[PDB]
Every structure is written in structure tokens, then in C-alpha cells.
Amino acid sequence: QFTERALTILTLAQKLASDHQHPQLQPIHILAAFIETPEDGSVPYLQNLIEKGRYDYDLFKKVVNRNLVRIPQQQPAPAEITPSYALGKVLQDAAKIQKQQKDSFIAQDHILFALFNDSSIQQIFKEAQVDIEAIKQQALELRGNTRIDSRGADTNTPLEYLSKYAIDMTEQARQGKLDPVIGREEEIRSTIRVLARRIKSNPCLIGEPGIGKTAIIEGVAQRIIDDDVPTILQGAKLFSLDLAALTGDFEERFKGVLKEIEESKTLIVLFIDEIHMLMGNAANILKPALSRGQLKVIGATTNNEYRSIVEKDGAFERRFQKIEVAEPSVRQTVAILRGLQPKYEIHHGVRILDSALVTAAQLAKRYLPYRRLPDSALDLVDISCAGVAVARDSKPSMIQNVVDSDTISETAARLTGIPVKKLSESENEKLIHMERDLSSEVVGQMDAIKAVSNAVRLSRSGLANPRQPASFLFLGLSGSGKTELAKKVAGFLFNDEDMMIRVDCSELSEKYAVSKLLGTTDEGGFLTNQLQYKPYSVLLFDEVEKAHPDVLTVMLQMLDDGRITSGQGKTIDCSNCIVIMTSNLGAEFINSQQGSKIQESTKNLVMGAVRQHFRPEFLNRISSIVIFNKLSRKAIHKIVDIRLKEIEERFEQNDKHYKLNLTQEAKDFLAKYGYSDDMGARPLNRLIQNEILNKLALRILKNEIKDKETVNV
Amino acid sequence: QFTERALTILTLAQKLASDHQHPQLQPIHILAAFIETPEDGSVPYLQNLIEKGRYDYDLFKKVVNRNLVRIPQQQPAPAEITPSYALGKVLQDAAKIQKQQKDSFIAQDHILFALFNDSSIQQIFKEAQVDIEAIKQQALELRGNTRIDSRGADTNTPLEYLSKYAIDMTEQARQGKLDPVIGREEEIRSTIRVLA
Amino acid sequence: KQQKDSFIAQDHILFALFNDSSIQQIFKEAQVDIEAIKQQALELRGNTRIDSRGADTNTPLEYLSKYAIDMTEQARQGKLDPVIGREEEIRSTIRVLA
Amino acid sequence: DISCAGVAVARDSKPEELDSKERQLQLIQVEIKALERDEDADSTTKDRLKLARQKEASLQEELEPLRQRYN
Ligand SMILES: Nc1ncnc2c1ncn2[C@@H]1O[C@H](COP(=O)(O)OP(=O)(O)OP(=O)(O)O)[C@@H](O)[C@H]1O
Ligand SMILES: Nc1ncnc2c1ncn2[C@@H]1O[C@H](COP(=O)(O)OP(=O)(O)OP(=O)(O)O)[C@@H](O)[C@H]1O
């Protein structure tokens, strides 16, 4: 039976016979119904079955221009009020070729197919078109199996189906639309390598989003239109799915392409983005036909996405090769950064200095966890582009070239902040002065600090395995810098308080591999999240001495490789991560520091304890273990003052401008009552406000303090 | 007042009769002025309500200048000097469909519309402008919402009811109709930034 | 084509037989030309019977297709690969049917 | 088959070694471009432009003769 778009074809010739008020349904109505507009946009028109197959229709278009208009006048009601079986035998008569394309019901050409019998101007110059086979011929010769039922423009587009969802950038290549690619070359060649196998030509590309996985396809196709596509491969061209709404459940449409491209004679390729569809319920789609062994197909993913369906399946695996896409090098970035460098600055009507370009690639490489310098650099760039180009655009211009700095800096400032660190000194002088920097926090443990400052350089220069943590287990008490130190650490290192990340073993006696994010069975993402939020980071564990067989055993991986697996299966870099461990074990021996005990002696004395509490392997990834020992007034009162230093931070700083007085006795009193042997004046610290702030807040309440009015005890 | 878009053609139609310096403004003139070239950038060719309504202009592209070259030549000042109320009515006559099709000003269809009598090949073989037959037909095809207000853009379904689902505030902007938000450019700082 | 087929089956030959295979006379035993065959070919196969094989659908049948498929003919068609070495292995698998 | 590919790959198109040379060619040739584009005392024509033009002259030779094996 007819297509609904044949009905829509019918609609037009009728709508013609409606608007142009033809009193009956005649042979020649359906050409205007056929022709969309003078375009070949109708499968009947020019690229059509007709012109190329046997004779040009544009002629029989050019002439029927009148035939359309030679219809007589009507009055309002009667126009085309009849089905006109003279024409309307095609209601039955069109059933000729409907199935013979291996189909269901009648189509545009196919109703027309019976029209060469029915609808035609068969005359001295016979206007009847492609004659015996030629229609059916060209019905097959153009697409063919051109329609099924009612769905999609009846003999849509110049050809048939696909081309709606068929997307080819070899065009855009040969159209120049495509970005040149870099450095995925033999990677492509490996993808290319995928392609020869009678067993599996079908790749899958594992790796981070935004890495270029689709942009990969460029060079794929680019080298294809370069005819770096090899012999077998040359015949194919670019095609890949642009996921269409099915518009009940129309995957038949998406089934449509399948044999279509299958019939299409290997002229193209199939690439598939990411969800290679696992529906929660459509399940096998194309999969068996996909499993047939024709139908070249490309996969791409990152780990867990790959881990989604195929782990069930394995047939994808059975039907594919998975191929990791390595996050490209910074210079891979830097290089292909320059690729659209001219572009985006011209996109943004500006100029660039590679100075920034590398600089972001330098800097930003660390600082966007989620997105990828494989893009984010550029993403910074467009970002870098605009606002300054905006500072050009409506008015805020002479700056056209990207500044190095602000384009990173200000944007980094836009991105995060505290440029001054991110501004100049990179990787290095921080180190030399790190200790003397860190010497701020609490004196003593300086060696450890040095060792830290050492180990962080062990953490650098890649001498120590660039895949490996920085392994730090600390001894002391509350107040002692397991208490503290991390605060400085990333604040020094990552310039943050929160790259420091809190973990308590007391929480974890048994199963926390459960809440580590186990394999979903209810989402334990925390640890993962902790990095998955925060990749360049500092890892504080608490009660580490009580670390239980569970938590410690992943500590091993944490100890290992500078990488962290998940329960969902993702592994996650620990290398750029810093690990921090509360250990109070030798608290005895720590307490013995009353004797100001020979450290190593008491360390050795301690060691056995910790040596007991931990298998060596643990101990033997540990990059150091140190006490946080006895405190000197020298230390103390300064450390005291340290908070006293920063009192202002909101107060005299971001609020009050309060002009500070302290009596040294009080400054000592601080130590005096306040310093706790075991816990320090860290308890008094909590107290401080009481004896300090409220004491002032009192005056604040009073107003005996006006700004700078200050009286203390 | 006439539609600018219409008047854009109209004065260009006055310009049309000026280039060959026609003696008079007469029905078959703007049949050339309606069309820069067959591009739907000139709608009167294909996108015209007639090619879809009645008379396709493809080969009917042929005859328009054929007349305006065969007009008796004139000199500059008498060119576009006259409405020639035979044509000069189209000024007013364009206001006839604005009622049947429900419009207010005089638009590209209307300037076109009025012409539907003699602007043509009117003969035994008449390649011409049907009177109500092409437009009221296809002035719904085109558009369907003829009213464009006192100030408006192309009056032929600009994006298919683009102003009937989304207000333009740049109206009210250009119209100055909303209290400009404040401390908001740093937001905008994002926006424009967000854009490019 | 209206039987929606690449090949011409035993319903299709009879389909043409609807004229000279008939008694079309004063008392007409014709053969129903279009109406009855089609929808009863909509009963019996469909496009489902593309064609290109041996032929099987006599009496109550004309199915064993779609999911039903065989590679034996395909092997006689040489559609597939000569195996090795699982012979006596197959000898078992074979002898299982016994 | 993968080997059969890898050969064909090489055999499929220009022998990796050829395209490897094609590759490294493409590497700096675009790099050297952007360098002098701006007024610089450091990244300008001084350093890498001289570096590349020799570095490009290093492996440029074998290509067409080793392509002449295909000829
Ligand atoms: N090698 C490359 N050559 C050219 N452009 C690239 C390259 N890598 C990335 N891009 C650019 O990155 C943008 C999109 O990145 P892309 O989507 O390819 O990353 P992705 O890992 O493929 O994420 P997706 O899942 O969408 O494929 C495009 O503008 C593209 O031009
Ligand atoms: N090494 C140190 N570096 C910086 N501040 C220190 C240090 N030692 C003591 N302090 C003081 O202690 C304050 C912070 O104490 P902190 O929050 O680190 O204790 P904690 O985090 O509760 O850990 P714990 O329970 O093991 O003591 C600082 O503001 C400072 O005044």
C-alpha cells in the first residue's frame, strides 16, 4: 500500500489540486507532488531515477510547468472532490514494485512505477518516463529498498535513506572543513591496522573523553582522502552515527541504515561514538547483523564506558578490537594547539602568542582535572581568546595577540586564583626555598621537612618512578603536624588547603573496600571521588596505625604505581598525589621525649612497633617515616604567634583593621597555661578566641574598641 | 506606510524604471524589480506565492526585462517621476489583500498583490498574476501571520513564526524598554566570553 | 516485486497461472488473480520468502526460515572454511546422534 | 592478519619508514612556521628556525630514492 509520504506526495498533488484547485485527480498531478521545488530534491526530479536512467525529466519538467497550469478553473468546493479511479486504480495498481525492492508497501517512484502505465503523457513525444526496468532499475539503482511503510520522505532526498543520518567528512575533508590532526598517525595506522582483518576490522578506542576520539576520525578520513587509506580500505569513505531521536520505538529507522549501508557496497565506514548502545532494555540492535562480519565499525570509549556492556557481552570484544587512546603529550597538544591557533584567533578575530599557548599547555595541563589539555588548552584558548577579544569587541583591542600571562594567568585567575604562584616560579625555586618556606609552620621536624622537600624532588625529576606515590607516614601527637603539616604542604605544593584530603582508619575496621567505591552492587565513590574530584592532591589518612587489612591492602596500590583502582574498575593516578599518615604508635616513646629521647634510638624503639603494625612492603614503599617531636618555646611561642600572625586574616584583614596588642607574658601565657604537652596549645587554639576574640568581641560589643582601640591582658 | 522590505523593492522598482530610465511606472515593471536574480533571495521567482500559487517564474523569468527594455526610453527626471495611477494604485491597491489575508501595512506580498491585474503577460496566452488565486493561497504558505506591527523584518514567516514563541528583547533593548541590569557586566563578562 | 521478492516462487508461478490455468468460460473456474493470493501469501510467506535456495513449502509448511537457517548447503555452496583435526573429535559429536 | 595488516599497512600505503619520514617532516615544518611570525628575541628565527632547517636537512634525503623502490 502507499507510503504516508506517498500520501504526502499525494497530499501535494492534491494540495495542488486543492490550492491550484484541480477538480479531479489526473495523471500529471503528482509531478509537482514529486518535485519538491525546481531542485532535484525530489528523487523524481533531476539526480532522479529519470534524468540519468533513461531521459532527462527537467525537459519533461520544463514542459509540465504548463501542464500544471493548464488545469481549468474550479469554484471553492468541488476541486479534486473525486478519488478518480481512472487515476485511483493506482490505489491498487501501485502495488507492482512496492515489495519487489524487498520492502513492505508502495512508494513515490513506486506509485509512479505504475504511473508509467497510468500517469504519463504518452504522445507523439511520449512523456512517460523511465520505461520498462529503468524506473525499477533506477528504483533499485537509486537506493532501492527505498522505503518500508509510511515513514520518511517517500523516496526522500535525491537518493533514498541514510544520507539523512549518513554523515561524511571525507567531503568535509575534500571540502577542507576538517582540522588536520597530529600524532594519532600510526595510532590511526593501528586503527587502520585494525581494518585488514577478515576476522575483525572493527576497532574500539579506549580513553578519556575530549581526547580527540572523534577528531581522530579526521586523520582517519583525512588520510583516507589522502588515499593513505590502503587498497582494501580505499573504497570506503567516512560515515558514522549522529545519534538521532527515534522520533513508538522506531529503531527500524536505525535498522534502516543497516542493510542500506550493507547494500551500499563498502563505499564508506561506520564509526560509533561512545554509548555503543546498551539500552537498559534496544539491547541487540544490529548486533547480530553487526556480528555478521561485514559492516566495518569503529568503537571509542574510556575504560568504564567500555566496561559497561561488553563486560556483559564480550561479543563486542569478540567483534572488536579495543584500542587505548593515550592522552597526548603536552607538546602533542602544543603542536596541534597551533593547528587551530590561526583559526580561533581568526575565529575570535585576534592573534595569539605561542608563549601563552605553550604556557597553558604548560600550566593548565595540571589544573583542569576533568577536561583535557588535548582540548582544555584550546578550551582555555577560546576562553583566552574571547574576553580579551571581548576587551576588543564592543569596545573593551590593540592587544590582539594573546598575552602570554593573563591569557593563562588572568584566565587561571578566572579559572582558580592566586596567580602569583602560578605566575612565574615553576617546579623549581619553590623546592630550594620550600623548607625555609615551610620552616614557617613548626620548626623541628625540619629534616623530615627536608626529607619531604627531598622526597618531593624524589617526586620530581622522574628519577624516582614517575609512576609512584610520595609515601609519607608520620609520627607525633595531636598538634604535631600529622595534626598540621599538610596544611602547608599543598598550600606550598598545590597552593591549597584542600588538596589535603581527610581519611580516618577508625572508620575503617573491616570492609571499607565496600565504601571505597566497591564494584556497584550503593555508590561508594568517595575515595575515587576524592581524586575524581581532585587529581593533584594530598592524601591524609588518620588512625593509620589502626589501618586494617582492607584499607592497607589498597594502600599497597596507593603505595604502588602512583595509580588507584576503583571498585567500578577505574584506575586513577596516585603519582601526582601526596599521601599523609597519622601514626601515634610510639606514643610511649613519643611521651618518653620528655627525656628528649635520642630520636633514632627511640625511633628504632618505635620502629618495631610500626614495624610490627605493618608488613614491610608497606614499609618499603614508604618514602619516609618521622616523629614529630618535642616543641621549644622558640617553636611554641612562634607557632603561637603563627595563628596570632594570621588573626587579621579576616579580621584586621578582610574586616576590622584592628590594631593588635599582646603582652609577651600573655604571648607566654599562651604557652603557659595554654600549651598542652601532648596536644599543644592547639587545644588553647580553640580556646584562643575565648580569652582572645570574645575578650575583644566584648570590647567590640562595648565599642571601647573603635578601630585600633585595643586593650589586652 | 509601505513595508521597508517592500519599499526596498519599491524604490528599487522606482530605481528599476530609472536604470533604463523608463517614461512611466507601468504594470509589468517591478516584475523585474521583484527579482535581483532567480535566487529565492528574490522570492518572486520561486518562493513567490505565485510559482507555488499559480504561475511558476522559471522560464517566466524570461519576459520581465523584455518589456522594460521595450518600454520607450526616457530621460532621468521623468523616470520614476510618475506613479501613473494605473500603477500608482498599487500603492493603495496593495492594501486590498492586507484585509482578505489580514494584514495592516503594505508588504512584499501586497506590493506584489496589487499588481495582480496587468502586471503580467496578459494575452490569450496569459502568463500573469492571478488575483486572489496565488497569494491568499500561498500567503498562508508564505507566513500565515501577515501582521508584522509598525516596525518589522521580512514579512514572509521569518523562521516560521519566530516572533510567535520568543519575544525579542533586543526590541525592548533598541526600544529601551527594560531597566538595565546592574553589576551585571561581570556576568556579561562571562557571557560574551562564554560565547565566542 | 509486488510479492516483494527477488526470486519467483511456487506461489508466483501459480500467480501467473491465474489466467490460462483456469476454466474461464460460461462456468468460470478462473484462478483469483490478485485479491486472494496476496493476503493469503500475506498468510503464506510474504516478503519473507525472498527466494534463492532449493524450494520447500508444500502443504502445511512454507516456513523454516528467519531464525531457521542452515550452513550445510552453504558448505555445499562452499560458503565456509574446511576445518582440520577435530575429525575424531567430531566423530564423537557425530556419534552422539546415534 | 594483523601482521598481514601491518605489512599491508606499510604495504597498504607508504612503508611506515617512508611515512615516518613524511611524519617527522610534517613535525617541525609547521612548527618553524609560527615561530618568526611575531617580534621576538628568543623564540624568533634565531634559535629553532636555524635548528629546524638543518634538522629538516638531516633525514630529508632518503625519501624519493627509497620511494623509487616503489618506482
Ligand atoms: N588531533 C586533533 N586534530 C584536530 N582537531 C582536534 C584534534 N584533537 C582534538 N581536536 C579538536 O577537539 C574538538 C573536539 O574534540 P574531540 O571530541 O575530538 O575529543 P574526543 O576525545 O573525541 O571527545 P568525543 O567523544 O566527542 O570524540 C574539535 O574541535 C576538534 O577539532
Ligand atoms: N606544624 C605546624 N604548622 C602550622 N600550625 C601549627 C603547627 N603545629 C601547630 N600549629 C598550630 O595549630 C593550628 C592548627 O592545628 P591543627 O588543625 O593542625 O590540629 P588538628 O588538625 O586537629 O590535628 P590533630 O588532632 O592531630 O592535632 C595552627 O593554626 C597553628 O596555630
Q: Ligand 2 centroid to A484 CA: how many Å?
A: 4
> Can you give the three-state secondary structure of A293-304, one letter per residue?
CCCCCECCECHH
> In a 10 Å sphere around its CB, with 0-12 CB exposed, 13-18 middle and 19+ buried, how is residue A347 labelled?
middle
Q: Ligand 2 centroid to B164 CA: how many Å?
A: 64
| Angstrom distance (rounded) from CA A508 to CA A615 | 18
Closest CA to B133 of A80, A406, A75: A75
Whether A320 contacts A203, CB under 8 Å = yes
The closest ligand to the CA of A172 turns out to be 1
All residues at 6 or more sequence positions from D50 whose CB lies less than 8 Å from its CB, including other chains: none
Q: Does D44 touch chain A (CB under 8 A)?
A: no
Q: Ligand 2 centroid to A682 CA: how many Å?
A: 6
- Tell me A651's DSSP state: I
How far is residue A649 CA from its own chain's centroid? 38
Signed CA dihedral, B71, B78, B131, A27: sign only: positive
Q: Does B196 touch chain A (CB under 8 A)?
A: yes
Give Cα separations from D34 to A341, A348, A424 (angstroms). Answer: 10, 18, 24
Give the position, in ligand 2's atom list, of the atom nearest the Cα of A542: 26
Look up residue D25 and give its amino acid: L
Backbone angles phi, psi at A288, to 5 degrees: -65, -50
A338/D1 touch (CB, cutoff 8 Å), yes or no: no
Q: Whose CA is nearest to atom 18 of ligand 2?
A: A484
Does residue A214's CB lie within 6 angstroms of at least one atom of ligand 1? Answer: yes
All residues at 6 or more sequence positions from A560 whose CB lies less than 8 Å from its CB, including other chains: A468, A469, A574, A621
Contact exists between A and C (3 or more beta carbon pairs < 8 Å): yes
With a Cβ cut-off of 6 Å, ligand 2 is lined by A 441-442, 478-479, 481-485, 639, 642-643, 680, 682, 685
Q: Does D19 touch chain A (CB under 8 A)?
A: yes
Experimentally determined by: cryo-EM
Closest CA to B53 of B134, B130, B126: B134
A228 → closest Cβ in D11, D13, D26: D13
> In a 10 Å sphere around its CB, with 0-12 CB exposed, 13-18 middle and 19+ buried, how is residue A487 labelled?
middle
What stretches of chain B show up as alpha helix (H) in DSSP? 4-19, 30-33, 63-70, 85-93, 97-100, 108-114, 135-141, 169-174, 185-195
Closest CA to A111 of A193, A12, A249, A255: A12
Cell of B6: 517592500
- Tell me C47's DSSP state: T
Contact exists between B and A (3 or more beta carbon pairs < 8 Å): yes
The closest ligand to the CA of A642 turns out to be 2
| Angstrom distance (rounded) from CA A241 to CA A165 | 7
A406: closest CA of chain D, how far (Å): 18
Which residues of A fall within a CB distance of 8 Å from D4? 196
| Angstrom distance (rounded) from CA B31 to CA B63 | 9
Backbone angles phi, psi at D55, to 5 degrees: -60, -35
B192 → closest Cβ in A69, A347, A393: A393
Look up residue B68 and give its amino acid: L
Which residues face A321 on adjacent strands?
A203
Using DSSP, state whether B31 is helix, strand or coil.
Answer: helix
Q: Whose CA is nearest to atom 27 of ligand 2?
A: A478
Which residues of C fall within a CB distance of 8 Å from A92? 34
Q: How many residues does chain D have?
A: 71
A556: closest CA of chain D, how far (Å): 37
Q: With a CB-CB cutoff of 8 Å, which residues 13-72 of chain B face chain A?
A: 46, 52-56, 58-59
Give the position, in ligand 2's atom list, of the atom nearest the Cα of A628: 1
Q: Grid cell 582540548 — which residue? A: A375
Interruptions in chain D after residues (C–N over 2.5 Å): none
Q: Grid cell 597552593 — which residue? A: A495
Which residues of C fall within a CB distance of 8 Å from A98? 1-2, 4
How many other CB atoms are there within 10 angstroms of residue A534's CB atom?
19
Backbone angles phi, psi at A541, to 5 degrees: -110, 140
| Angstrom distance (rounded) from CA C39 to CA A136 | 23
- Exposure string of A157-175, with b = 16+ CB inside 10 Å and e = fewer, is bbbbbbbbbbbbbbebbee
Give Cα separations from B18 to A668, B11, B94, B95, B115 (angstroms). Answer: 101, 10, 22, 25, 19
Using DSSP, state whether A537 is helix, strand or coil.
Answer: strand
Whether A304 contacts A569, CB under 8 Å = yes
Give the position, in ligand 2's atom list, of the atom nearest the Cα of A646: 29
Which residues face D17 on adjacent strands?
none
Look up residue C32 and give its amino acid: V
| Nearest residue on chain B to A33, alpha-carbon basis | B52
B193/A383 touch (CB, cutoff 8 Å), yes or no: yes
B137/A19 touch (CB, cutoff 8 Å), yes or no: yes
**How far is it between the farthest Cα atoms of chain C?**
71
Test site for ligand 1: of A188, A211, A323, A343, most ligand atoms within 8 A of the Cβ: A211
Whether A537 contacts A501, CB under 8 Å = yes
How many other CB atoms are there within 10 angstroms of residue A101's CB atom?
25
Whether A585 contacts A537, CB under 8 Å = no
CB pairs under 8 A between A and D: 58
Look up residue B31 and give its amino acid: L
Q: Grid cell 509537482 — which residue? A: A32
A207 is an annotated ligand-binding site residue: yes
D8/A353 touch (CB, cutoff 8 Å), yes or no: no
A68/B56 touch (CB, cutoff 8 Å), yes or no: yes
| Angstrom distance (rounded) from CA B176 to CA B181 | 12
Q: Grid cell 592532591 — which residue? A: A537
Q: Does A104 touch chain C (CB under 8 A)?
A: yes
Which residues of D fall within a CB distance of 8 Å from A228? 13-14, 19
| Nearest residue on chain A to D26, alpha-carbon basis | A182
**Rounded to the nearest 5 degrees, what angle is found at the Cα of B49, between the Cα atoms of B48 and B52?**
90
| Angstrom distance (rounded) from CA C55 to CA A410 | 78
A100 → closest Cβ in C2, C34, C38: C2
Does residue A326's CB lie within 6 angstroms of at least one atom of ligand 1? Answer: no
Which residues of A fall within a CB distance of 8 Å from B53? 19-20
Q: Phi/psi class of residue A286: alpha, beta or left (left: φ > 0; alpha: ψ in -120 to 50)?
A: left
Whether A229 contacts A236, CB under 8 Å = yes
Q: Ligand 2 centroid to A478 CA: how many Å?
A: 8
| Angstrom distance (rounded) from CA A126 to CA A101 | 27
Does residue A80's CB lie within 6 angstroms of at least one atom of ligand 1? Answer: no
Q: Does A389 touch chain B (CB under 8 A)?
A: yes
